[PDB]
Amino acid sequence: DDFQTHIHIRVEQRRGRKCFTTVEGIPPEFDYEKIMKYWKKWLSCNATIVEEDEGKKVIKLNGDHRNQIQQFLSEEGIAAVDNITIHGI
RNA sequence: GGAAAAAUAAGUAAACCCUACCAUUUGGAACAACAAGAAGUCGUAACAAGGUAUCUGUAGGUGAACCUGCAGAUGGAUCAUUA
Ligand SMILES: [Mg+2]
Ligand SMILES: [Mg+2]
Ligand SMILES: [Mg+2]
What we know:
Blueprint: E1 7-13, E2 19-24, H1 32-43, E3 47-52, E4 56-62, H2 66-75, E5 84-87
Parallel strand pairs: 1-5
Antiparallel strand pairs: 1-2, 2-4, 3-4
The structure holds magnesium ion (3 copies).
It binds one RNA strand through helix 1.
PDB class: ribosome
Keywords: ribosome, translation, translation initiation, small ribosomal subunit, 40S, EIF1A, EIF1, translation initiation factor, eukaryotic translation initiation
Entry title: the crystal structure of the eukaryotic 40S ribosomal subunit in complex with EIF1 and EIF1A
């Protein structure tokens, strides 16, 4: 029985050195578009909203943003460092 | 008669305040650039018909260059086709 907030931050290879930072497990209650906007400007990126398995909304930024983001979430109290997991490879 | 102090009226007017400014410097909360360089980030606007020809004025949109509307210029990729 898990209702708590856990956030998975992926880094996926696009082509060559270029990549993706995929933010997964943002609670549905937050307007994703505002985070889209503010992140595009904050990080200087293009980014997208992606629909998975009919319920799951993920954020896809170009380039590797993980620490910037984890900091954004802790600072904005969307999570504790324990609930934010960062998988890079 | 002469004449010092002391007083008197008007003037010259230093200095010190109050108002409003000018000049030459200067302290300063708060804002805050620019040029140069290159092994940071996102993309690839422009050079070739840069891959949607560019570019000017304007107006709107917008992570970013930029994009789109209207009128314009070849500095164009056309000096050129009535039968
Ligand atoms: Mg003065
Ligand atoms: Mg520079
Ligand atoms: Mg404008």
